[model samples]
Target: NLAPLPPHVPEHLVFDFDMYNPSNLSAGVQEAWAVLQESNVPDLVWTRCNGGHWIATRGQLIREAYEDYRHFSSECPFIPREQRQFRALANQVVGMPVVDKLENRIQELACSLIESLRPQGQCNFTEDYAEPFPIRIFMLLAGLPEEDIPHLKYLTDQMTRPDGSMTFAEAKEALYDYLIPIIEQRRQKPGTDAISIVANGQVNGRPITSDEAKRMCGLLLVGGLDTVVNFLSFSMEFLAKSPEHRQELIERPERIPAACEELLRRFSLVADGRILTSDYEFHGVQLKKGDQILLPQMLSGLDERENACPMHVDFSRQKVSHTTFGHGSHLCLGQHLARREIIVTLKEWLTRIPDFSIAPGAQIQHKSGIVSGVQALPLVWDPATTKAVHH
Candidate 1:
């Protein structure tokens, strides 16, 4: 006997949506997991692609697993054990010592970059602000130069969404090779930056080795480049389309903080989740250890069970709770800095180009991976509408 498809289910429907392509994508991605919420399809199911894994469609289950680190370890968070092992090794190299110590320096890097763009009006916000702002900050944090960004970003993108050029394993190796020398250089001549701090940091009161430092720096680079960039892009795209929301912020600027919270919750840009750690039953179905489950950070808030009219964005809602950043011990450490950057952008940009939109006849494309974003946002507006201010 097979489980009944939820009411209104289509015959022979499959949810093998890819997160990377740029077209028919928003609905494809948002609707893929929406299928699960249509009815209580509890427990895990198998998919043929990407080594087969389970998907956790609801917020409650995802929060529970993310919180219970013992049951779900962040050590090997992604799919395919081989890739996970490589990630684990890299993380061990970089994460053991530098996560806390170098964070302040990293934040400063992000701030300095933001300062450069704050005064300019009508710049392609996605390319000018969202993408490079975080990437350059990450490079500074990793003790790397601006020149290395294109190569590094390409490698990291492969890991997040494979494109047949390199497997996850290959990407890890390439990153390790790149970072090792940087770690060595920083170790020989220590400085007041993330790479130097991580290279010289102690794990269990002993200085971390060069390889370890490289791996941890690599992880930080990936997170710094991917997460905030995607999040800010998606949030701004929505804000530009909804002037009512923008007007609310213009009237009460303080609401920008709440706006950030609601936007993060509603968009839930980071959809990557962990593989199940053990064989057991959840919600009356059997799940085995090592089963890859997609615990989406985006889908839960959309469910009616969690919030009223889940699709509506209300900054003033009383019970505005969701795990947009993450939950449990692995919750995002850079969240405070991310909030600051986004709020500042809203306050500063709106002051200049208070009104703008996607360019006439241009299509906005969305793509997905560990993070989702609008690949090309062609925005157009009149220069006359913006008042010029001299520094």
Candidate 2:
């Protein structure tokens, strides 16, 4: 007498969560998602706000969905199909030749910056080390001057943490506007930098247009400014808290590479996923084609199903399976550079200031969005621990 829920029937699950709040995010995000897991929420659930979409909770489901690009296109990965359309333009810009060429230069710039800080003995860690490192590297990679870093960083921060100065859409538009002229200039006189590559690059064997190049450069700005910057902060904060783990790396420096893998797994920061193309039945529930799913790239390794005691930092743990750098074809292209920077920082910092932690009575707060991270990490260390060597 009753009809079964459509293979893709939509259901409602409201989540009152926002990443910009200045709170203990490390616990907040985990706790918020834990609620959904406890309720045995379906792999895909609809929300009333933001044009309702699906959310993939487990690592396996998310990995599968991300791999099946035919069903879940990355063309416009963000939620709300309209937003996706706008993002698609940005992705095209990133595909330009000028942007692609900056990869090696970006890596070199990061290494140079780290080298300068390695012997400093004492640094603020966040502002002194993490923030400026990636932004400057991106500027060099983009063929931009170092002088613009401060202004650009400010704009990027607003996009991540809007401070009443600009709406999200306004921020994005301003970013595009800023890049348009740069893209045009790079196209005319293509240089060796990433911006030139993006400007002169081609898709489908034809040169990319100026508008497309601008969007791609904009994406790079976000990735360069937000993702790695926050990641670097979280990794250092975690290491600061866990000395035993830090000592393990110091003893077996070779293990530093593997430790980076484990750290990324434990502190999975990026929250990126794809949208379902059409109505489909998954895990006994129906997901509409347009539903936006939040498959946090950082969650799987934390899942009890994937790792034994997922929260523990096991540097020697065998078979460290994680999607920290993402999975499948859409895997992070800049991963090699990111891993190198992380490894370099861990090795260098420990040698200089082997022990440090969140300053007394100071709370370490975490924030989330496409990228999740620490707000302010006040680190303190004994000055005596540092070796006197000026670079």
Candidate 3:
């Protein structure tokens, strides 16, 4: 179940933790990972799961590694990349202006989506609301057909939270295949949509190739589809348990933004690694070139050192710390858009259905992977307590 240890690695440092399946996963995905930070465990440990890699369990080390990008490259191997130029193109799609323009549409979609579920009294929030809300918003932004969501979302899910239906290579190829034709068409006739922007965008004063466009487009699909969707369920799951948190927001709507930030820290999900570019010593540990180190963006805030009583969600906390979006040069480009979606969902949902709880006797399960997620969140509330809103 574990990879053979290389001669360069010492046996005493081995923790053998599996990222895909943790022993305490049933407790909670974030909690499951936090187990690595216990006093007995070192700040960094080599795990044998998922082909054996170094996992930085503390915020300090994760930030240091992220800052030293030259040592640990985002690209497993070098490409003399035009990374920033492509990132610029990504910002054009989901950056401030795009989020500002889509503000009304975001709020409308959040309100409408919640309202649709209000009458049902009982609904699997994950499938009923969480999945569709962000998917539809991203499709609307990209100008992709709403009907294409099933296929695109499937590919994105397979890439992030694979169920073994297809290898990651297969998932990526399918996503690229879907984008190739669309990128070609958009190149010839551009529109205001995200796809059109990427299609016609330039990198370093040169027209981006169809290949480059497809890759960037594939990233947008995964970033847009998977991230906020799962995050919504996680945040809502927390709120369902803490009615006091929900009431605080309802009593003081102004706290929603702070609450959103707090929740993002507690429920942060997204773990990606950097491949070592050269042999190096890190925090007293020896590493060979090509060794991969996982800097879980999710772990930073959860570290007790970074935040006081890190597990407790306190909206009024003076300093909310975490690399939930990411850090250094590669911070997530879609964060502005993601924040808008989360904030809108919190504000709108509470305004309408203020009282709801997880369906009794139903156990909520979380899946762990590159991006952690809630499998289903069945929520129930009395319809009489709900209020309808008219725009």
Candidate 4:
């Protein structure tokens, strides 16, 4: 049930769109949210879902709200007030490492993972490659065991989309519990990994406290585990179904980067919101203070006005304009890492397993949230078709 809105909010702005659970969800979350960008829906609409919130449909409005942080705060980016707490720790450990710096490590792992699976004729792309590839890298960085991934991944997902079985606070506390002891240990003996760095990290030349380290580490885990894991699945699911798209990269590897950008624009799947700091007039609408506005990073690129044939995968697209990583001061910090991960997977995976398709008669399911996902991906290919490439 959605929450009631402020008395001042007008009926015209209420379009009844649910950010978490859209009516067209069976079509795909991106397609579901694109309903707002249709010729009929307004630029901004209010949905009485997750206790009620506003949605910015167009790319222009989404960017404007993100840029004007003074009016739109990032204190609570997700729905259901119960899980709005991830931002507290997030605001602290916000900066990201250089994407170029992480490229070599990411590439190394991508190659190793694909090589390990190259000989197999078939594989569950999600479990075999997608989850393990980026996740193991994150676990290595956080100084946690690979075995902890399933548990840690569950806790991380809870922080964004609660299934009602566990509250956001419970997830956050469990993450802190796992990190506190490790962060404390890393402090006494710092290492080259990310967790150790944050443990002894400082702000304005003053060392941050242990509690601060836990908060920072918690976010790092959430970001690292979640981002690339889901995106890769979404992209690959498209490729398995569209052999023509795969041929573009397989024939002209130079187009891989551009293809990556196009894919990010189309399959982009994150929908977070900001709290209105003050009552403000926007695009012929009046937004009340404390009201939540859902600024979907996904919908921007899907708007036809932003890109021609917004839904089509156009590798040759001269201008790919979308806020897939987000926009403004809160723009994705680890986008660099994300890009490297995507590009590497594209360049390497297709080079060896160039010919593959979704298993016959297998249905692909998609799950939604602030971050959306492909529930599972079963890819099938002929062993004779796969090349035994060396890393």
Candidate 5:
């Protein structure tokens, strides 16, 4: 029946929704998932998609589950079994090294990238800058070689997105292979780099094990390379199309931070799930052990119940409530760095290339999976409108 429905999931609550490819995703991932909170749908829906998983649609239920992690274990934090055990900790003991020391450098690098593209008047923002800007900074912090960027970025993409040729285990192992050697090198002789701090760092008040350090370092590498890199693309994609919003941030510069928050809310991505530890009734629904429920951090903020005018990007919205960075013990560790990257990009890029749009007749497309990403962002603007900012 409906390709093997999970036990106790009522027929009324069942909706065949695919996390990787939702039907309405083309409209916009935020709007697509918001249908879960639509008047016709219930707070929790049992989707027979991706092998029958439960989805916590409303912010109320999503938050409750996150807050109560004992019952809802982080054992399987992602839907695909490969990414299950990846509930990771931040390298805070490393003292946010990259951001603290290189804040100005980060700003300069962003402006430099924009200036390089300014005269061209047309560029694929995603490829030209989105991929390079953040990755370069991360490579710098990790003390990685620029020559290794292509290999590392390819490995990172495999973890987030695969061609189905490589299993998650295969992809993860490949990433660990690249990191373990570098991690070992750093541990044998520590340096002032991010990788060294993490390799020689302590966890739970003891010297961290090499295996532990490598695993954590693996998370750190994939964390920055994937999240902030893709987020910049999404934010810029919006700025290129929404003239009013762009001008608001460009003209009222102070509002850039607020605009960044609103945009992060509206275009939120990153979906991970928790495994059910035992059979339990939650929000008037029955969940059993071994059942994986995707408690999307992206969906909560998009829920109308959580934020009025849920789909709109209102920079002035007084209270922006969403779990985009996640909640509870597993909240994202690199959120502060991600925020700084976003704010700097906004202020610097607008000051230079203030006006641009989706290159003529180019239909912007998006891809959805564990992370929602712009497939390609071809942006165009006049060379005469650009300014050069000295770093």
Candidate 6:
């Protein structure tokens, strides 16, 4: 149900596009969002769907709002200053060095996952590979028990792609409840695991509290489990349908990194927003205080002004610009790890299962939510054409 328009919001500025459930979602999640960038729509508009929030349609406004965090705060009720220090401390676990340490394991898991699926001739890529690949790696990294993955993944999914079984606040509280025990344990006797490191981390030159550590770990759970896990399916879905794109990487090999960047630009997901801190006029539009504005991290690269053909994936694009990891101080802490996961998955998966395609007669469906994803990528390949790696 759409809320009545606010007196402060002009009728001209209203564009009722639902972020959780876009009208054109059947076309593709990203494509559904690209509708906002159509020439007819303004750069910034207000949507009555999802509780009537401001939607920043273009890269310019999105970046500006993300950068100027003072006026557009990430936290809804809002906080001051602490996010930066917490983000810095969280970086230690997810940074490039950690990715480097996990490099061999990443390849091993990718290859093993691919090899197991190769002989099957067909598999739901989302569940068979994409979900397990990064999630298992994250499990290994965080020192969380494999048995707990289902519970954690369920909670994470509820937060990002709600099934309406619980409220977002309720899902978050459940996650916090789960982490409180773990955080307290780790705080007392720090282990080398990511959770332990975060538990004992410092902010404002003091040891972080259990509550703060739970919140940070909660962030990691979403990033670690959902972000890259969903991304892999999008990338692989593209590769399955477009053999030409796959051939480009298989042939050149060196282009993997560039192709990765282009793919990241094209299939960029994760749209979240900020709450307006004060009554402000942004891009000539009056935004009242206590308003919520969605600045999609996915939109920047998809903007025609930012890239020539925003929808098409072009590996050779001279400058691949995107905020897929996000912009400004609250940029995703797990980006370095995400990049390595993508790069390594592409390289290893292609090396083993060089030829594959979407299963015949299966319609690929995209789900729209905080983290947009391919519902289930039913991919098929000939067992004969696939090569097994001995390593």
Each candidate's number of clashing pairs is 5, 15, 0, 1, 0, 0
1-391 in candidate 1: lDDT tens per residue?
2333333223333344443332346563454445566664543344434555556667788788787766666656655453344334334434535445555555455445444554443456677777777776566545577899898888887987678899988999998988888778878875866677667766654677777677667667777666787777777777777888878888898888888888777777776667657776665446667655667677767666788877788989767767777777666656665666566667666665666676667656667666777675555556666544332
- Where is model 1 more than 4 Å wrong at Cα? 1-28, 39-51, 74-76, 80-124, 142-144, 147-178, 188-190, 389-391
The 0-to-1 C-alpha lDDT of every candidate, in the order given, reads: 0.65, 0.67, 0.88, 0.81, 0.81, 0.86
Per-residue lDDT of candidate 5, residues 173-223 (tens digit): 887888888878888875877778777765566666778877877777777
What is residue 258's positional error in candidate 3, in angstroms?
0.8
Model 3 segments more than 4 A misplaced: 77-81, 158-174
Error of 2 at 152 (Å): 1.5
> What are the per-residue Cα lDDT tens digits for candidate 3 across 261-346?
99999999988789988999999999889898888899999999899899999999999999999899989998999999999998
TM-score of 6: 0.93
Highest-lDDT candidate: 3
TM-score of 1: 0.77
What would you estimate as the lDDT of candidate 2? 0.67
The residue-level lDDT of candidate 2 at 44 comes to 48
Model 2 segments beyond 4 Å from truth?
A: 1-28, 31-51, 79-124, 388-391
State the lDDT at 224 in candidate 6: 68
**In model 1, what lDDT does residue 177 have?**
89
- Tell how far residue 269 is off in model 4, in angstroms: 0.4
Model 6 agreement with the true structure over 94-179: per-residue lDDT tens digits: 88888889888878878888888889988998888888877688787888887988887788779767999979899999989888
TM per prediction = 0.77, 0.80, 0.94, 0.89, 0.93, 0.93
Which structure is stronger by TM-score: 1 or 2?
2
Candidate 3 collision pairs: none
lDDT of 4: 0.81
Query: For candidate 4, lDDT tens digit of each residue in 1-391?
Result: 7668668768877788766678888887788878888898889888887788888999999999999999998887767561223333343333234345556766777888888888887889888898787767776555568789788778876876578767988988888898888878877874766677777766555666878778766666667655688899989999999999999889999989888899999999888889999999999888888888889899889999999999888889989999999998777756766787889998889988999999999988887788888878998898798886664
Worst lDDT run of 10 residues, candidate 1, spans: 1-10
Q: Model 1 residue 15 lDDT?
A: 45
